Amino acid sequence: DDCMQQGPASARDLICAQYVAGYKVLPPLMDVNMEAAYTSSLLGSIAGVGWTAGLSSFAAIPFAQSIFYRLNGVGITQQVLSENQKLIANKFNQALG
């Protein structure tokens, strides 16, 4: 109906071409809110999933605490991480910002 009451948006409009040419674009398997739900639940699982042995238990720990274990695990000592917690958070924030 949009392609009849408004018509094509521009030259070579491939969406309105569907009803003319004989082809159809099909909808995806999941709607947007469901896909968002999957990645949102994934976000909330990060700190407590990559923490210890096995995939069966969940440690509901702060994100920040997770980061410090992750940094310690790559060779930054705890004395360093303890002295620099605000510096580390700021650098992380700059990287994402």
Binding site: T52, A53, G54, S56, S57, A59, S82
Partner: protein
Amino acid sequence: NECVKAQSKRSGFCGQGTHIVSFVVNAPNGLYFMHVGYYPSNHIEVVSAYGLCDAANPTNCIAPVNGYFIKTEWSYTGSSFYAPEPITSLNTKYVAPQVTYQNISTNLPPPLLG
């Protein structure tokens, strides 16, 4: 090589859940993998420590190995199955002290009774 000839630590590579063992048989145009995984159930919530320190001797601290320190005073449980057992030198490692470690002053486990 990853599944059958080895236990995998890669989530989702082999089967779902925690991989234990896989088997292989032939199939009409390939291989049929039979991945046996460990599937947890009936999860409960308990309160855990990041580590424990001797309150009198604050530089002497432990962290659990492949498990957790849980309240019940403190005991150890393996990470995949709740089953409290005493904290011993076989389920702990000595660590540098941290602000998140608990200061314990009474029923100190044997690795801290120094």
